[PDB]
Design a protein around this motif. Structure first.
Motif, PDB file in Angstrom:
ATOM      1  N   UNK A  43       0.773  -1.131   0.093  1.00 53.71           N
ATOM      2  CA  UNK A  43      -0.007  -0.068   0.037  1.00 53.71           C
ATOM      3  C   UNK A  43       0.853   1.233   0.083  1.00 53.71           C
ATOM      4  N   UNK A  44       0.212   2.340  -0.101  1.00 49.61           N
ATOM      5  CA  UNK A  44       0.869   3.575  -0.267  1.00 49.61           C
ATOM      6  C   UNK A  44       0.966   4.807   0.903  1.00 49.61           C
ATOM      7  N   UNK A  45       0.794   4.162   1.960  1.00 54.87           N
ATOM      8  CA  UNK A  45       0.633   5.050   3.033  1.00 54.87           C
ATOM      9  C   UNK A  45       1.949   5.487   4.018  1.00 54.87           C
ATOM     10  N   UNK A  46       2.772   4.133   3.927  1.00 53.38           N
ATOM     11  CA  UNK A  46       4.010   4.190   4.620  1.00 53.38           C
ATOM     12  C   UNK A  46       4.867   3.576   4.285  1.00 53.38           C
ATOM     13  N   UNK A  47       6.346   3.762   4.615  1.00 55.21           N
ATOM     14  CA  UNK A  47       7.428   2.976   4.205  1.00 55.21           C
ATOM     15  C   UNK A  47       7.680   1.818   4.939  1.00 55.21           C
ATOM     16  N   UNK A  48       8.055   0.688   4.547  1.00 61.17           N
ATOM     17  CA  UNK A  48       8.363  -0.517   5.181  1.00 61.17           C
ATOM     18  C   UNK A  48       9.647  -0.069   6.244  1.00 61.17           C
ATOM     19  N   UNK A  49      10.395   0.975   5.871  1.00 60.39           N
ATOM     20  CA  UNK A  49      11.813   1.392   6.431  1.00 60.39           C
ATOM     21  C   UNK A  49      11.601   1.835   7.923  1.00 60.39           C
ATOM     22  N   UNK A  50      10.269   2.370   8.103  1.00 65.87           N
ATOM     23  CA  UNK A  50       9.866   2.906   9.388  1.00 65.87           C
ATOM     24  C   UNK A  50       9.201   1.742  10.346  1.00 65.87           C
ATOM     25  N   UNK A  51       9.117   0.633   9.673  1.00 66.68           N
ATOM     26  CA  UNK A  51       8.507  -0.573  10.659  1.00 66.68           C
ATOM     27  C   UNK A  51       9.599  -1.823  10.841  1.00 66.68           C
ATOM     28  N   UNK A  52       9.312  -2.506  12.080  1.00 70.23           N
ATOM     29  CA  UNK A  52      10.169  -3.651  12.512  1.00 70.23           C
ATOM     30  C   UNK A  52       9.427  -4.913  12.688  1.00 70.23           C
ATOM     31  N   UNK A  53       9.684  -5.957  12.695  1.00 69.79           N
ATOM     32  CA  UNK A  53       9.082  -7.148  13.275  1.00 69.79           C
ATOM     33  C   UNK A  53       9.823  -7.182  14.563  1.00 69.79           C
ATOM     34  N   UNK A  54       9.067  -7.637  15.898  1.00 67.78           N
ATOM     35  CA  UNK A  54       9.823  -7.701  17.003  1.00 67.78           C
ATOM     36  C   UNK A  54       9.343  -9.024  17.503  1.00 67.78           C
ATOM     37  N   UNK A  55      10.163  -9.930  17.790  1.00 71.97           N
ATOM     38  CA  UNK A  55      10.128 -11.124  18.566  1.00 71.97           C
ATOM     39  C   UNK A  55      10.407 -10.920  19.997  1.00 71.97           C
ATOM     40  N   UNK A  56       9.480 -11.584  20.919  1.00 69.97           N
ATOM     41  CA  UNK A  56       9.872 -11.348  22.210  1.00 69.97           C
ATOM     42  C   UNK A  56       9.896 -13.048  22.775  1.00 69.97           C
ATOM     43  N   UNK A  57      11.041 -13.103  23.414  1.00 66.12           N
ATOM     44  CA  UNK A  57      11.176 -14.342  24.038  1.00 66.12           C
ATOM     45  C   UNK A  57      12.447 -14.211  25.163  1.00 66.12           C
ATOM     46  N   UNK A  58      12.929 -15.505  25.303  1.00 66.49           N
ATOM     47  CA  UNK A  58      14.157 -15.772  26.339  1.00 66.49           C
ATOM     48  C   UNK A  58      14.563 -17.026  26.298  1.00 66.49           C
ATOM     49  N   UNK A 127      12.811 -15.310  33.789  1.00 65.98           N
ATOM     50  CA  UNK A 127      11.610 -15.109  32.910  1.00 65.98           C
ATOM     51  C   UNK A 127      11.501 -13.739  32.355  1.00 65.98           C
ATOM     52  N   UNK A 128      12.654 -13.075  32.505  1.00 63.45           N
ATOM     53  CA  UNK A 128      12.689 -11.816  31.666  1.00 63.45           C
ATOM     54  C   UNK A 128      12.546 -11.789  30.221  1.00 63.45           C
ATOM     55  N   UNK A 129      12.149 -10.576  29.483  1.00 62.66           N
ATOM     56  CA  UNK A 129      11.862 -10.750  28.230  1.00 62.66           C
ATOM     57  C   UNK A 129      12.816  -9.941  27.612  1.00 62.66           C
ATOM     58  N   UNK A 130      13.317 -10.663  26.344  1.00 67.46           N
ATOM     59  CA  UNK A 130      14.204 -10.084  25.504  1.00 67.46           C
ATOM     60  C   UNK A 130      13.555  -9.973  24.186  1.00 67.46           C
ATOM     61  N   UNK A 131      14.088  -9.042  23.305  1.00 70.65           N
ATOM     62  CA  UNK A 131      13.344  -8.404  21.990  1.00 70.65           C
ATOM     63  C   UNK A 131      14.122  -8.493  21.140  1.00 70.65           C
ATOM     64  N   UNK A 132      13.866  -9.087  19.776  1.00 69.29           N
ATOM     65  CA  UNK A 132      14.716  -9.310  18.611  1.00 69.29           C
ATOM     66  C   UNK A 132      14.044  -8.474  17.716  1.00 69.29           C
ATOM     67  N   UNK A 133      14.738  -7.407  17.213  1.00 73.12           N
ATOM     68  CA  UNK A 133      13.967  -6.361  16.270  1.00 73.12           C
ATOM     69  C   UNK A 133      14.633  -6.385  15.106  1.00 73.12           C
ATOM     70  N   UNK A 134      13.800  -6.887  13.984  1.00 74.58           N
ATOM     71  CA  UNK A 134      14.062  -6.776  12.575  1.00 74.58           C
ATOM     72  C   UNK A 134      13.323  -5.699  11.808  1.00 74.58           C
ATOM     73  N   UNK A 135      14.165  -5.384  10.785  1.00 71.90           N
ATOM     74  CA  UNK A 135      13.433  -4.234  10.056  1.00 71.90           C
ATOM     75  C   UNK A 135      12.525  -4.926   8.949  1.00 71.90           C
ATOM     76  N   UNK A 136      11.474  -4.209   8.770  1.00 73.35           N
ATOM     77  CA  UNK A 136      10.418  -5.099   8.140  1.00 73.35           C
ATOM     78  C   UNK A 136      10.679  -5.704   6.588  1.00 73.35           C
ATOM     79  N   UNK A 137      11.832  -4.859   6.116  1.00 71.72           N
ATOM     80  CA  UNK A 137      12.348  -5.300   4.615  1.00 71.72           C
ATOM     81  C   UNK A 137      12.797  -6.501   5.058  1.00 71.72           C
ATOM     82  N   UNK A 138      13.955  -6.497   5.822  1.00 66.18           N
ATOM     83  CA  UNK A 138      14.771  -7.770   6.189  1.00 66.18           C
ATOM     84  C   UNK A 138      13.807  -8.917   6.490  1.00 66.18           C
ATOM     85  N   UNK A 139      12.844  -8.690   7.335  1.00 66.29           N
ATOM     86  CA  UNK A 139      11.985  -9.857   7.769  1.00 66.29           C
ATOM     87  C   UNK A 139      11.220 -10.292   6.427  1.00 66.29           C
ATOM     88  N   UNK A 140      10.579  -9.655   5.594  1.00 66.75           N
ATOM     89  CA  UNK A 140       9.978 -10.021   4.257  1.00 66.75           C
ATOM     90  C   UNK A 140      10.778 -10.674   3.498  1.00 66.75           C
TER      91      UNK A 140
END
Ligand SMILES: [Mg+2]
Length: 203
Positions: A43-58, A127-140
């Motif tokens: 879609x034409x609203x936002x660039x993927x460069x502004x977005x991230x997939x966030x995995x939460x785990x430990x 049980x503490x939370x960690x976050x893997x942050x991947x830019x949305x382009x790389x995720x796709x």
């Protein structure tokens, strides 16, 4: 009384369809987020460069998350992992898109971290939370899952599969564990503790 001191977040427009209209299967949050990324790309609203997939785990794959639709009330769901989408809006305010939260969709970053994640200070450290942050382009570009983790030893589905074929790439048919892992030697993106995650994306 005091003034906040800009108002861009006040008029923020969601990057997703309304929650009801999004592609969604319970217990496939990695794919639900992948599909949100695909929607934004096409879609034409936002660039993927502004977005991230966030995995939460430990390391032990047991993370509490509050305000989850699977357990209405004030207790947590303990997930092995959970995936959300983060949008860093052009004004600077981050928003979390969690199709499984009872909080607003999308939700201001600070409220998500305070009400769904909560402090890790009184949580037993393993049980503490960690976050893997991947830019949305790389995720796709890189994510692949053959859904083999969702079948028991007889081949039976643990939860009904999404209604489209498995996501694959030219490089891989299955690398989901490289996203669930919080080991920086594995996978793509960056791995953050809760405090690192809030320092990077908080306001
Ligand atoms: Mg104030």
């Amino acid at each position: 009384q005091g003034m906040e001191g800009g108002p861009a977040a006040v008029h923020y427009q969601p990057a997703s369809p309304p929650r009801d209209a999004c592609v969604y299967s319970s217990c496939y949050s990695e794919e639900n987020v992948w599909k949100l990324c695909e929607y934004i790309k096409n879609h034409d609203q936002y660039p993927l460069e502004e977005c991230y997939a966030v995995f939460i785990s430990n390391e032990r794959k047991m993370i509490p998350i509050w305000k989850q639709q699977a357990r209405p009330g004030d207790g947590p769901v303990i997930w092995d992992y959970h995936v959300v989408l983060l949008h860093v809006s052009s004004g600077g305010q981050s928003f979390i898109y969690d199709l499984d939260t009872v909080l607003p969709f999308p939700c201001l970053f600070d409220t998500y971290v305070e009400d769904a994640i909560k402090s890790d200070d009184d949580i037993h450290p393993q049980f503490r939370r960690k976050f893997r942050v991947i830019c949305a382009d790389s995720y796709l570009k890189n994510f692949a899952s053959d859904r083999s983790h969702m079948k028991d030893s007889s081949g039976n589905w643990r939860e009904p599969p999404p209604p489209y074929p498995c996501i694959e790439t030219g490089d891989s048919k299955m690398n989901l564990n490289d996203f669930i892992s919080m080991d920086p030697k594995v996978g793509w993106g960056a791995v953050y503790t809760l405090s690192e995650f809030t320092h990077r994306f908080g306001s």
